[PDB]
Write a protein that binds this DNA or RNA. Structure first.
Length: 2010
RNA sequence: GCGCACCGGGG
RNA sequence: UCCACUGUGCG
RNA sequence: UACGCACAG
RNA sequence: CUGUGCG
């Protein structure tokens, strides 16, 4: 059929009219190979001809470039709002009348009317929007029936159509549904986007009122900056600067800022950090251990000597629980009497227990525990009861007190039983006894007295002599201290949930209330330790910081302290986790020979540090451990910043912090001593993980007001230092502030250095005119560009970056809303109201505590300079009692983004929701604008703070309009920066390349530079960006779009320059109160911080600082992409300058301010030879960075040992695990609301932890801790929460569903095997589409057990036994989800509609409203551990119809049936056995149970759909022989195994079209009114179609669980850092009767194996001679033809066709194909120049060279250029490349001018010339040859004619002038230069397919151990050298492709295959390879000097190729 | 024994 | 009455 | 499509 | 109106 295709191509070429506008599509037709793609292209060409003739007839010009209506109107100068994306075929504009023409061809009357109405509706969409801007739209639809046109004869058209359809029929028979519904829709699938308007140009809509201020600023930007310098001038200036800098540095007038690393000096500096506060320098370990156990009350309690009925339960506990549950009902008759009755009942129960068995529980001396966690005394209880009984007896008037008391007790108990029995539980659940009600209860409790200790609380620090226990009993090696800490932390956390009952009585009076308090009434929690019973006693409720005491019945007041209860969570139920963490950290350095005598001390120090940070979670204790990271990073480097030691020191207060510092110093001295030089990497990572312990403390702030004040000080201080602070700016700017802005703009550009007398001034904000000019000139003249950045023209970002939808700014994050008084928004606080509020607050706070000068003044002030305050307060309070005053001082409010967006959309009449519509085309929109902002007001931000691990950080919050404008700027700058290489902020491939380059640099021991910058945000300014932009030229030959783009961006940047920032209200109030106190003499003096001075100076004159505007600060992350772009260009220039000075080269990667720099061999050699020159080069780099307003942080390090980039460390070829960070992350209080959400969040966190080197043995412990936390809340553990016996493969190759499958298989083995077999067979049948009927509704949408049995028996396998079907699990919320406690249409169709309707205004409004409602509902739910515990056991279960029940009610109902049998495992997973004979009649409770087998089958099927079929195999545990003893710190990078390729991925289009073709009514009524001509119109076809339709039908019919969601998802590919020992001990799922996939895999493996033993030609017989070959099986379809690679297009078209022929190259292009071309820079010829009159001395610069070339005969200029074309197919495996060469002969005109006289064209490739001209026409479509783009010439030849090299870059921009007619080559001017050889059949050599001495494509399947074993057995038996060669070739080929052998164990494979010759074979193979090769958990190499094989190990001793290694065999 | 901008919190 | 702009990953 | 959490700038 | 639970 290739002949038919050739005939079609020839007839199309020689019969189609040669029209230029038809060429491009014609080019798309002559390159396709698939018959369906060829038919689509032919039909598209016919439609193009039809529409072009139609538009020519109607007069409308053709839309050849496919621009939208808005783009077309913009090109004509019409300003229109954002419109729906519609691309008309033709357009015509007449003044104000727009005519749009769309042409289509339909030969089916049924398929004709709907297209017409669809086009009419599409035009009516734009009609109203066009009318809104006063433009009349006249739709014009041209429908036809026949493909007849004047562009081609009718007969040839008919023949072409018939031949195309016949070829489609004859080529492949897969889907013959090409009726006039599919192919006609497929024809218009060429709606590729050419870019959309950004919306920045819409600023032209408003009036322009820019004035002298704007032009003055612009002139200041252009004052003394020259951006037209050549390379020679900038080179000279750089040389001068370097010479002067080096001279002044050597002479000593400039400081170094860098020091060479001296380990002894660093250790000495670290030891003397706090030299003025610690007495000694070399502490004793034993003395430190002695001091540790006696430092604080908590530490003393943890290590003190303390110590059957405890397990036993008495009546007191039962009565307390029952009374608590009853009181929960809140009878609320009278709280006092109810509490008295409860206390009396509890006392009676306690008396009964003591009388019976003499129990001592529930009593603490003379007090006992009441119902509501109340510790109360018996004296008050008996007195109150006697008084109440006497009053009642004397008011009822004969009955005595006992009778009335018993009557009241019985009445209360009866009422409680009646109120409790109704819901789900009677009194029998609480095993109470009614015997406690005695006939003489009143007399029994009236004479009862108990003696004991008195509970107390100490509010002040006292001596340590009062501790009643020995303080050193517990050892540090045991885990007793951790368990005690866990119990204490749980008590502290539970202390927060005590409800605030009636206020307790006053225990003390006066000052004695804060010295020692005897507790008569208090609150207490109970915890048991080692058999004892302790009470935590407090007096205050809530989450605030408070004082606690620990009491015991034997002796009271063990210890009292202060604590914040919400900081002690991580220690709860985590005692084994921390012990295992410490054990692993110690075992990391266990094999160090010099540390063998210090292991015990190291373990003790580590455990002491961990316990200390857990027990005392201080903020300032968190920063020392963080700075330890930078210390250890600088320790192993070569050079470091000289301010590192100053940065390390942090202020400390308490003695615990100093003890922590001493412990850290001792540990560092022990580890990093001078006589230990054995294992540097292990000690380095040990110290790093010690440093990372700071994550264990918290992230939330300790105090809010202090944090806000610190952040404001950080924000304000640098501005005050600079000298520009404008106070209270107005919407209408004043003259003085504008003058100040201009003056500071001039000052910012006046930085000087290295030339002035004073010299450089480091760490000063500003930029230098000289270096700014040099940077701009270097960018403009093209010396910063690479050869790969000029292959294509630069697109204009103004018309190539799309706009942002309104829903891109929608979230729950806060946003500011302004307050308007009458017509203008308020911007200033009121002084009088503020001071009145401050006075009121002072009086209130003194009244609550003050119960001397201070007392007199406060009591005088409470009666409302001094007279002014009196008058103001009297006038305000009387005429304005605190709530409204407090709310009337604020000047702004907060809300959500969604609410603001909905309010804005409510005021827009447009159809689409875009940012440009909201900004400009709105009812409340600006009319004009100025330099300071639009007329609606200046841009506004407000200050806030952030919670993080470390120091403070301020944040800016803007309103909606400022956010929109900032988003516009960010999008523009992101589009601008996307066109240059080296930025990793928005490019993950760049990040991967950076990581690979860093690893390669470290492996070669080159110098590396890790850099961060100090205060990147608060130092950058928008003025710097504006100045840089005003001097840059992007389109050097299109200076018309650049002007307007720069103007718009400059206006926006000036708006950002004139922003106003709002000070927080709390800060202002605090400062006002401080000022009032200080002015009155109450406060002290002296310190008087600068911020306080500023506030006081403003207050004295009577001004409240409300807003501050300055030129210096740029928001924290507000302008991120602009900063990234500036950093990129600045670093490029700095590297260029460094390369100009020295001879070396630097490769740099930056993201925002983090940077990694890699030096080449030259710089490393220079460092090794000439240290002074290297150091001064570093100095010059620092100086140049400082000159460009970039300050290097003291955290930067230069060295050859360790590299790091964005927290990814690499040391000497090893991976650095981050264990402590993620261990601490997984142990924190995650804010969750339901158990399943918590379980999945913990699972995600544990997966992330496993990805970062945490062993699974500890992740299992973390999961067990989470399950224990769930069990504490008394929640049943279903088998769908967590898996606690996972392996490495469970996390690397499996998702959550796979883990659930593993757990279910573990629970019930020997029963899931039959289910797996049935599922395997069913999936195999379904993939071929076999049944597709029974599974739809007969089984899936039906009953469960019977349908499961029927499905199992249908396939021919044995059904599960009756015992298996009884297994079930208790599914709570089986009807409605759980009801949390508040403290204050098919689903697929809905999802599609939500995705598609997000662009339109109405759909956006609906989505915003529903999201607002959902967020409001969610935000009022109690979260955290306390909230989750309170929610559970609080009537959370929803009943059948509508009711709420306790979990205890359900459990009791289940317990009332004797057939249900519970079953539990070791880990606590509980399931049930429910026989089928009791499933009828008791339907009330059986509805909560679900069978396990059905859920297992569903989950397994979904996992097989998502991951692959391998999950259906039989799992097994392998017994692997261990041959090498790995070090406990030997890690390995691993890649998850993938099985889904790019052609198996399903997108939105497939689902939409399936819905259209399956449910036309639903598609028409839900999807149709939301369809535009967007990318959704594209129709792509995949082999997975029938199965996708089945899944869509299943999802539509039933909404139980999603099934199509698992198809649009794939397994992520990413590195995992795992342990070798754990990796080698994982389970395996093998695959096992003929399957198409198995057959094709076997065939591919056979071909791959036989490709190395011998070579053969890929004929039709050789491929058919193999045993495994799909000889036209029953159901091949496309499932078996896609896993074939290059042969996929051959066997279907040649093997299964009765055709005998060899395979050629043309049978290697599968899928849709398209071409892409690149233009290389032109090159000179050395010989031609030298033989034309250019002989003599070399020239000084490029200008001299061009002048010399100019003075030549007019034909002496000869250049050569090459254009490279590449054809790529949809199945990207082989690209067809060719090229065309152009020789230009002409003369060089004045300077940068090139006049072309003659052009010669040649070509080289394997492409027929019949299409070449067309390809050339494509090149003529670009603006390069039209003079609208830059033309570049290579500089390699030019450097041979220059005296001074290292002066130019790689390209030079030279404009070219040439007539267009000379460039129109037509099919005959091209002359071939290649060999012109006939096509040759391919040869199957090693690896892949080889052409004639050229490797085109390669195939490489996956090889297992069995296949390699059998291949070795087959090959090595014949000969050994052949086996060696084959193995070496395979290893080298796979290593060249960057692949790992992580699925094969070569050592054991060779041991098993060849028991006696494994060593020699391995040695020979590795010697042949001679490189590091990664295998299944280990890497091997061969050493030349020592003729052996080395294995990589961190515990090794030898060095080899940049890795530590040791001998494999001893 | 909290916070530890002197200023807050701790029946 | 309180917490911003981005990037990666998962549900 | 949203929402929620972890890590990083 | 909502917890009494130490694997």
């Amino acid at each position: 059929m290739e002949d038919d295709m050739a005939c079609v191509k020839d007839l199309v070429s020689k019969y189609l009219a040669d029209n230029e506008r038809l060429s491009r599509q014609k080019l798309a037709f002559l390159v396709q190979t698939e018959p369906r793609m060829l038919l689509m292209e032919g039909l598209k060409l016919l439609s193009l001809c039809i529409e072009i003739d139609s538009c020519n007839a109607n007069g409308c010009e053709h839309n050849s470039e496919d621009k939208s209506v808005e783009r077309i109107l913009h090109d004509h100068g019409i300003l229109t709002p954002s419109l729906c994306f519609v691309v008309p075929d033709g357009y015509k504009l007449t003044g104000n009348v727009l005519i749009l023409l769309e042409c289509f061809v339909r030969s089916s009357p049924a398929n004709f009317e709907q297209k017409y109405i669809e086009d009419f509706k599409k035009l009516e969409q734009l009609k109203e929007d066009l009318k809104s801007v006063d433009i009349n739209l006249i739709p014009l639809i041209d429908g036809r029936t026949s493909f007849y046109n004047e562009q081609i004869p009718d007969w040839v058209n008919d023949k072409l159509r018939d031949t195309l359809f016949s070829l489609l029929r004859y080529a492949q028979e897969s889907n013959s549904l090409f009726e006039e519904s599919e192919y006609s829709r497929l024809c218009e699938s060429l709606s590729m986007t050419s870019g959309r308007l950004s919306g920045v140009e819409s600023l032209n809509v408003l009036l322009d009122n820019r004035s002298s201020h704007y032009e003055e600023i612009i002139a200041s930007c252009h004052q003394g900056i020259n951006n037209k310098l050549t390379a020679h001038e900038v080179k000279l200036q750089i040389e001068e600067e370097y010479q002067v800098f080096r001279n002044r540095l050597r002479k000593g007038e400039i400081t170094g800022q860098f020091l060479k690393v001296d380990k002894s000096r660093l250790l000495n500096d670290f030891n003397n950090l706090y030299v003025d506060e610690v007495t000694a320098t070399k502490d004793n370990i034993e003395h430190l251990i002695y001091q540790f156990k006696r430092a604080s009350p908590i530490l003393r309690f943890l290590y003190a000597n303390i110590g059957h009925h405890t397990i036993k339960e008495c009546q007191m506990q039962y009565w307390r629980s029952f009374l608590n549950k009853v009181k929960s009902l809140r009878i609320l008759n009278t709280r006092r009497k109810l509490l008295l009755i409860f206390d009396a009942l509890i006392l009676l129960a306690s008396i009964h227990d003591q009388t019976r068995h003499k129990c001592s529980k529930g009593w603490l001396g003379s007090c006992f525990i009441s119902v509501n966690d109340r510790l109360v005394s018996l004296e008050s209880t008996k007195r109150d009861l006697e008084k109440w009984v006497g009053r009642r007896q004397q008011s009822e008037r004969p009955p005595d007190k006992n009778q009335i008391l018993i009557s009241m007790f019985q009445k209360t108990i009866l009422k409680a039983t009646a109120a409790l029995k109704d819901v789900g539980i009677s009194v029998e659940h609480y095993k109470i006894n009614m015997e406690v009600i005695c006939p003489d209860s009143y007399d029994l409790i009236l004479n009862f007295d108990v003696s004991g200790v008195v509970p107390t609380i100490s509010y002040q620090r006292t001596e340590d002599e009062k501790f009643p226990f020995i303080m050193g009993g517990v050892e540090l090696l045991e885990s007793t201290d951790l368990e005690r800490l866990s119990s204490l932390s749980l008590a502290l956390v539970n202390s927060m949930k005590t409800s605030s009952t009636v206020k307790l009585r006053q225990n003390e009076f006066g000052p004695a209330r804060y010295q020692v308090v005897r507790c008569k009434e208090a609150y207490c929690q109970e915890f048991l330790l080692s058999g004892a019973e302790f009470q935590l006693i407090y007096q205050k409720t809530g989450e605030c910081s408070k004082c606690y005491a620990i009491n015991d019945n034997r002796v009271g007041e063990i210890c009292s302290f202060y604590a914040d209860p919400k900081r002690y969570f991580p220690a709860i139920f985590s005692a084994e986790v921390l012990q295992t963490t410490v054990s692993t950290m110690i075992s990391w350095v266990k094999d160090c020979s010099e540390l063998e005598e210090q292991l015990c001390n190291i373990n003790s120090l580590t455990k002491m540090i961990l316990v200390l940070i857990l027990a005392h979670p201080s903020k300032r204790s968190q920063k020392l451990l963080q700075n330890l990271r930078y210390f250890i990073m600088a320790y192993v480097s070569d050079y470091h910043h000289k301010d590192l030691i100053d940065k390390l020191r942090e202020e400390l207060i308490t003695d615990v912090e100093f003890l922590l510092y001493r412990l850290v110093r001792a540990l560092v001295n022990l580890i990093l001593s001078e006589d230990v030089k054995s294992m540097m990497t292990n000690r380095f990572k040990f110290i790093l993980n010690i440093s990372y312990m700071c994550h264990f403390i918290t992230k939330e702030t300790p105090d809010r007001l202090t944090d806000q004040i610190k952040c404001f000080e950080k924000f304000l201080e640098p501005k005050l230092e600079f000298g520009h602070v404008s106070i209270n700016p107005a919407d209408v700017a004043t003259e003085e502030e504008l003058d100040d802005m201009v003056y500071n703009a001039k000052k910012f550009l006046s930085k000087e250095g290295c030339t002035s007398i004073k010299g450089p001034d480091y760490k000063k904000p500003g930029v230098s005119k000289r270096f700014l000019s040099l940077l701009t000139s270097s960018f403009n003249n093209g010396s910063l560009f690479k050869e790969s950045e000029v292959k294509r023209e630069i697109k204009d970002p103004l018309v190539t970056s799309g706009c942002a939808t309104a829903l891109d700014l929608a979230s729950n994050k806060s946003v500011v809303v302004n307050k308007y008084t009458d017509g203008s928004r308020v911007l200033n606080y009121d002084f009088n109201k503020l001071t009145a509020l401050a006075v009121s607050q002072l009086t209130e706070v003194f009244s609550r505590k003050g119960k001397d000068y201070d007392y007199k003044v406060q009591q005088a002030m409470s009666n409302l300079y001094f007279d002014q305050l009196k008058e103001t307060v009297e006038r305000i309070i009387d005429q304005y009692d605190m709530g409204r005053l407090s709310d009337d001082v604020r000047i702004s409010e907060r809300e959500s983004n969604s609410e603001a967006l909905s309010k804005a959309l409510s005021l827009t009449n447009c159809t689409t929701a875009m940012l440009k519509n909201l900004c400009f085309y709105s009812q409340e929109s600006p009319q004009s604008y100025s330099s300071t902002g639009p007329d609606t007001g200046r841009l506004k931000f407000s200050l806030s703070y952030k919670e993080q691990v470390g120091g403070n950080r301020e944040l800016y919050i803007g309103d909606l309009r400022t956010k929109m404008f900032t988003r516009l700027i960010e999008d523009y700058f992101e589009a601008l920066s996307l066109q240059l290489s080296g930025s990793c902020l928005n490019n993950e491939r760049e990040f991967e390349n950076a990581i690979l380059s860093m690893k390669l640099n470290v492996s070669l021991a080159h110098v590396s530079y890790s850099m961060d910058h100090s205060k990147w945000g608060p130092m950058m300014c928008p003025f710097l960006f504006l100045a840089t932009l005003q001097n840059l030229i992007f389109l050097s030959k299109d200076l018309q779009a650049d002007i307007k783009g720069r103007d718009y961006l400059s206006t926006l940047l000036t708006w950002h320059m004139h922003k106003m920032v709002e000070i927080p209200f709390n800060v202002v109030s605090a400062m006002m109160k401080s000022f009032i106190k200080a002015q009155l003499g109450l406060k002290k003096k002296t310190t008087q911080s600068i911020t306080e001075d500023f506030f006081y100076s403003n207050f004295q004159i009577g001004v409240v600082p409300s807003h501050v505007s300055s030129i210096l600060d740029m928001g924290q992350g507000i302008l991120h992409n602009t900063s990234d772009f500036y950093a990129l260009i600045s670093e490029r220039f700095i590297n260029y300058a460094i390369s100009c000075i020295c001879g070396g080269t630097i490769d740099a990667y930056t993201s925002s301010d983090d940077q990694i720099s890699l030096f080449d061999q030259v710089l490393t050699e220079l460092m090794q030879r000439d240290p002074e020159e290297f150091k001064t080069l570093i100095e010059f780099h620092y100086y140049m960075s400082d000159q460009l307003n970039k300050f290097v942080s003291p955290k930067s390090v230069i060295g050859r040992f360790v590299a790091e980039f964005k927290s990814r460390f690499y040391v000497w070829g090893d991976e650095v695990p981050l264990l402590t960070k993620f261990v601490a992350a997984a142990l924190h209080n995650i804010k969750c609301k339901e158990p399943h959400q918590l379980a999945e969040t913990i699972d995600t966190i544990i997966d992330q932890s496993v990805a970062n080197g945490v062993p699974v043995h500890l992740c299992n412990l973390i999961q067990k801790r989470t399950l224990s936390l769930l069990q504490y809340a008394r929640y049943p553990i279903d088998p769908f929460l967590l898996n606690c016996e996972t392996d490495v493969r469970d996390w690397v190759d499996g998702n959550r569903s796979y883990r659930i499958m593993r757990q279910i298989e573990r629970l019930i083995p020997d029963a899931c095997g039959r289910i797996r077999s049935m599922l395997r067979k069913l999936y195999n049948k379904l993939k071929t589409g076999q049944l597709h009927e029974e599974f739809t509704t007969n089984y899936l949408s039906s009953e469960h057990l019977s349908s499961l049995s029927n499905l199992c028996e249908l396939l021919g396998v044995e059904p599960p036994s009756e015992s298996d079907l009884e297994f079930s699990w208790l599914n709570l919320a089986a009807h409605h989800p759980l009801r949390m406690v508040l403290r204050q249409v098919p689903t697929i169709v809905k999802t599609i509609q939500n995705k598609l309707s997000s662009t339109f205004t109405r759909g956006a409004q609906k989505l915003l409203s529903e999201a607002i409602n959902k967020s409001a509902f969610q935000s009022s739910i109690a979260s955290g551990f306390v909230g989750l515990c309170r929610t559970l056991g609080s009537k959370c279960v929803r009943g059948p119809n509508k009711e709420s029940l306790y979990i205890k009610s359900i459990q009791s109902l289940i317990s009332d049936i004797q057939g249900i049998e519970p079953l539990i495992d070791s880990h606590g997973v509980q399931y049930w056995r429910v026989p089928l004979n009791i499933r009828d009649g008791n339907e009330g409770v059986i509805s909560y149970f679900r069978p396990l087998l059905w859920d297992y089958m569903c989950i397994s099927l979904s996992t097989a759909i998502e991951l692959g079929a391998w999950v259906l195999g039989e799992p097994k545990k392998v017994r692997v022989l261990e041959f090498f003893k790995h070090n406990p710190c030997d890690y390995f990078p691993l890649k998850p195994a993938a099985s889904k390729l790019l052609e198996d991925r399903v997108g939105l289009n497939h689902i939409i079209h399936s819905l259209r073709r399956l449910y036309p009514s639903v598609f028409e009524k839900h999807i149709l009114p939301f369809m535009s001509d967007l990318a959704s119109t594209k129709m792509k076809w995949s082999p997975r179609i029938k199965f996708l339709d089945l899944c869509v039908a299943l999802d539509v019919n039933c909404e139980a669980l999603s099934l199509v969601s698992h198809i649009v998802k794939w397994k992520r590919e990413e590195h995992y850092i795992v342990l070798s020992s754990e990796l080698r001990l994982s389970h395996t799922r093998t695959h096992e009767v003929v399957s198409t996939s198995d057959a094709v895999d076997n065939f591919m493996r056979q071909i791959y194996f036989e490709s190395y033993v011998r070579s053969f030609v890929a004929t039709t017989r050789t491929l058919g001679s193999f045993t495994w070959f799909p000889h036209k099986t029953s159901v091949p379809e496309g499932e078996g033809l896609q896993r074939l690679g290059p042969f996929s297009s051959f066997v279907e078209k040649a093997i299964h066709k009765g055709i005998e022929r060899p395979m050629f190259k043309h049978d290697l292009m599968m899928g849709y194909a398209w071409i892409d071309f690149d233009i290389e820079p032109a090159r000179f010829n050395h010989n031609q120049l030298i033989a034309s009159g250019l002989v003599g001395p070399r020239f000084d610069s490029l200008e001299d060279f061009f002048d010399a070339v100019e003075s030549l005969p007019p034909g002496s200029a000869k250049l050569s250029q090459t254009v490279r074309f590449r054809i790529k197919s949809q199945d990207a495996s082989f690209k067809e490349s060719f090229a065309i060469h152009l020789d230009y002969t002409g003369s060089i005109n004045q300077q940068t001018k090139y006049l072309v006289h003659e052009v010669s064209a040649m070509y080289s490739g394997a492409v027929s010339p019949c299409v070449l001209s067309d390809c050339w026409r494509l090149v003529l479509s670009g603006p390069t040859f039209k003079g609208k783009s830059a033309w570049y010439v290579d500089t390699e030849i030019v450097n041979e004619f220059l005296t001074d090299t290292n002066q130019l870059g790689h390209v030079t921009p030279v404009e070219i002038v040439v007539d267009m007619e000379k460039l129109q080559f037509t099919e005959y001017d091209f002359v071939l230069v290649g060999p012109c050889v006939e096509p040759v059949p391919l040869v199957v050599h090693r690896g892949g397919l080889w052409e004639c001495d050229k490797k085109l494509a390669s195939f490489t399947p996956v090889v297992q151990d069995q296949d390699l074993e059998m291949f070795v057995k087959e090959v090595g038996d014949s000969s050994l050298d052949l086996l060696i060669g084959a193995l070496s070739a395979m290893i080298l080929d796979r290593l060249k492709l960057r692949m790992q052998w992580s699925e094969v164990d070569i050592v054991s494979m060779l041991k098993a295959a060849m028991p006696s010759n494994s060593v020699k074979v391995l040695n020979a193979v590795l010697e042949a390879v001679d490189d590091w090769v990664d295998f299944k958990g280990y890497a091997l190499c061969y050493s030349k000097s020592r003729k052996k094989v080395m294995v990589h190990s961190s515990g090794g001793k030898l060095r080899l190729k940049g890795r530590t290694c040791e001998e494999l065999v001893k």
